[PDB]
Ligand binder design. Structure first.
Ligand SMILES: CNS(=O)(=O)Nc1cccc(-n2c(=O)n(C3CC3)c(=O)c3c(Nc4ccc(I)cc4F)n(C)c(=O)c(C)c32)c1
Ligand SMILES: Nc1ncnc2c1ncn2[C@@H]1O[C@H](COP(=O)(O)OP(=O)(O)NP(=O)(O)O)[C@@H](O)[C@H]1O
Ligand SMILES: Nc1ncnc2c1ncn2[C@@H]1O[C@H](COP(=O)(O)OP(=O)(O)NP(=O)(O)O)[C@@H](O)[C@H]1O
Ligand SMILES: [Mg+2]
Ligand SMILES: [Mg+2]
Lengths: 304, 277
């Protein structure tokens, strides 16, 4: 759990974050939309990403929010997006972070057809080590891993984002969005005690979705799996809870990968693989000692 | 195609509009003067004749109501694309704020009385064949023992659900929705076609009863998807963790019953509430 080149890049990011000091609204000029915006700090030549969460509550709670958010200045990892500061402006709290020119794996998968197995191996290593970092050094679980919160860049780093550091921010958000893709673990859906095993389940589900190019619940019939190579929220959730978990097609994916996801997608979280079991799994031992030019595949596929 | 303010039995000469009373998802609510009044301004599409005639159907229904536990509908003027509904102004605070005020004591007798007031109002509305469809503590007002229900019927015409392939869900909403409704929410769901009924209103009153005794909404800890699944399969909390007797919990067992036909009418519920200690 240590490298040199990563040490160098983290040192450089520390140096950079030194530049900013304090933040407020007029420091920033809207460049583009990514709610999150690609923005340009003027007091310092940095391109940042600024996410604006709209909250409407009294000042004492927002002060508690920023105090809780300040912990991200302390966490630093090659597998975690960089955090710069959090301020309040005009009924919106701003989180400004490292900008990732490749975006989330949601949209890269949207433009590509499917993501090949070895790159998914690399991202699996990234995610597992990031989660291990959070659990071991800060006693926090991510609580919301999914493709849209895994970020990729043309320099070739993959990091986690949007993880659960502040209980009060969870309380303070007025309304949530529920769509047709759920990444919540079965035990969380049922309201029982949970741990980072839930994040491992969510990672498994994200991995199978990215590998097949389709959200895998409900499973497709033979016709759509053939060609690859109107549902109510409640019955999707009940499928996740009571039907057997999704699984990769047996022809086009390695045994190690199939077993890796199958171990991630075990319903009983006690029998589900934990972080270190996955750290010693055959699939990521194989993927670890491989040379893939992730930056190259990325840039070529996204046109960057 | 038109609704004028002279069409109403409340004589009207002038209408003044004051400050905004509060934020909300359906129109804006201002102070007004007529006595003092509450004016809800709503916006619609320039030529959606369909929903406009639906709306007039509804407000013609509302013109026949009058009951001490129901907000006084005073008048509605339409003129597209912007329409306004004018009702009496409630002195006091919402039940939502009262319940969450640490300086306010909420003993079991007082909660039973508040519940009975809400039940009388709801049974009046049901007797006239009007469904509330959005009963909740932010839509009840409490002033030193006077309890008034507001915003009945609006939810049909509300549009409070309106991202792509993603249904917007407000905190507090799902725990008022009866299982039959929860099992049908989709990113395609529309307020005017959800299967509201008298039983769903009784369910929402059950949620209010829980909130009256725990002084917080049920499922407070849980995220929205967990709440949808738990409620759709029929898992519901009780009040034994805070020492409430069997009788105060039986109200919840009845109002939250999984099959609609097992839920009581508001008349039966009024009876059940009378028989508490
Ligand atoms: C649905 N499950 S849930 O009901 O239990 N709610 C819940 C659960 C898990 C995570 C969050 N969550 C979150 O989704 N986002 C994203 C808005 C969409 C957050 O940004 C977020 C957050 N900001 C944040 C922090 C660091 C970086 I680097 C970048 C960021 F944007 N911080 C501080 C949180 O602490 C949580 C807990 C967040 C909500
Ligand atoms: N630091 C960042 N760098 C690049 N893209 C980002 C960054 N932060 C957010 N985005 C993008 O901003 C968009 C909005 O993300 P977000 O606000 O998280 O909502 P969402 O992705 O639609 N669903 P969710 O991630 O669960 O909230 C996504 O396309 C993200 O990829
Ligand atoms: N007759 C009234 N007297 C006093 N305040 C009122 C009255 N009618 C509405 N309000 C207030 O107007 C504001 C907006 O109410 P409304 O538009 O109904 O949204 P809401 O029910 O309070 N919250 P939401 O359900 O998320 O839309 C709230 O602060 C209400 O308390
Ligand atoms: Mg996100
Ligand atoms: Mg209201």
């Amino acid at each position: 759990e240590l490298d040199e080149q990563q040490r160098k890049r983290l040192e450089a990011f520390l140096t950079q974050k030194q530049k900013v000091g304090e933040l407020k609204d007029d420091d920033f000029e809207k460049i583009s939309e990514l709610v999150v915006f690609k923005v340009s700090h003027k007091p310092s030549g940095l391109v940042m990403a600024r996410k604006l969460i709209h909250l409407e509550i009294k000042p004492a709670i927002r002060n508690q929010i920023i105090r809780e958010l300040q912990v991200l200045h302390e966490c630093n990892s090659p597998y975690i997006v960089g955090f710069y500061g959090a301020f309040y402006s005009d009924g919106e709290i701003s989180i400004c972070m490292e900008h990732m020119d490749g975006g989330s794996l949601d949209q890269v998968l949207k433009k590509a057809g499917r993501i090949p197995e070895q790159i998914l191996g690399k991202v699996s290593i990234a995610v597992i080590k990031g989660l291990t970092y959070l659990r071991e050094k800060h006693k926090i679980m991510h609580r919301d891993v999914k493709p849209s919160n895994i970020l990729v860049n043309s320099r070739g780093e993959i990091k986690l984002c949007d993880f659960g550091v502040s209980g009060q921010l969870i309380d303070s958000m007025a309304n949530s969005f529920v769509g047709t893709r759920s990444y919540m673990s079965p035990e969380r859906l049922q309201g029982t005690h949970y741990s980072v095993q839930s994040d491992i389940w969510s990672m498994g589900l994200s991995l199978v979705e990215m590998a097949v190019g389709r959200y895998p619940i409900p499973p497709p019939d033979a016709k759509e799996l053939e060609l690859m190579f109107p549902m109510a929220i409640f019955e999707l959730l009940d499928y996740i809870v009571n039907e057997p978990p999704p699984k990769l097609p047996s022809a086009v994916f390695s045994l190690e990968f199939q077993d890796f996801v199958n171990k991630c997608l075990i319903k009983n979280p006690a029998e589900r693989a934990d972080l270190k079991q996955l750290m010693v799994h055959a699939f990521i031992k194989r993927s670890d000692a491989e040379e893939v030019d992730f930056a190259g595949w990325l840039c070529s596929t996204i046109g960057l | 195609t038109s609704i004028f303010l002279q069409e109403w039995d409340i004589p009207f000469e002038q209408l003044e509009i004051g400050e905004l009373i509060g934020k909300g998802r359906f129109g804006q609510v201002y102070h007004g003067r007529w006595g003092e009044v509450a004016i809800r301004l709503i916006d619609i599409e320039r030529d959606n004749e369909d929903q406009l005639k639906a709306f007039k159907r509804e407000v013609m229904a509302y013109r026949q109501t009058r009951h001490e536990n129901v907000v006084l509908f005073m008048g509605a003027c339409m003129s597209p694309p912007h329409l306004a509904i004018i009702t009496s102004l409630c002195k006091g605070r919402t039940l939502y704020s009262v319940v969450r005020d640490a300086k306010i004591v909420l003993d079991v007798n007082k909660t039973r009385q508040i519940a009975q007031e809400i039940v009388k109002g709801m049974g009046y509305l049901h007797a006239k064949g009007i469904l509330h469809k959005d009963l909740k503590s932010k839509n009840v007002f409490y002033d030193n023992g006077k309890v008034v229900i507001t915003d009945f019927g609006l939810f049909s015409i509300s549009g409070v659900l309106q991202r792509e392939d993603k249904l917007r869900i407000q905190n507090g909403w799902l725990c008022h929705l009866a299982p039959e409704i929860i099992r049908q929410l989709s990113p395609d769901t529309e307020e005017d076609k959800l299967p509201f009924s008298k039983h769903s209103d009784v369910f929402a009153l059950g949620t209010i009863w829980y909130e009256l005794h725990a002084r917080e909404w049920p499922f407070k800890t849980q995220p929205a998807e967990a709440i949808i699944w738990q409620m759709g399969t029929g898992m519901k909390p009780n009040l034994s963790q805070i020492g409430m007797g069997k009788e105060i919990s039986d109200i919840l067992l009845f109002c939250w019953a999984f099959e609609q036909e097992e839920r009581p009418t508001f008349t039966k519920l009024m009876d059940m509430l009378e028989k508490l200690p």
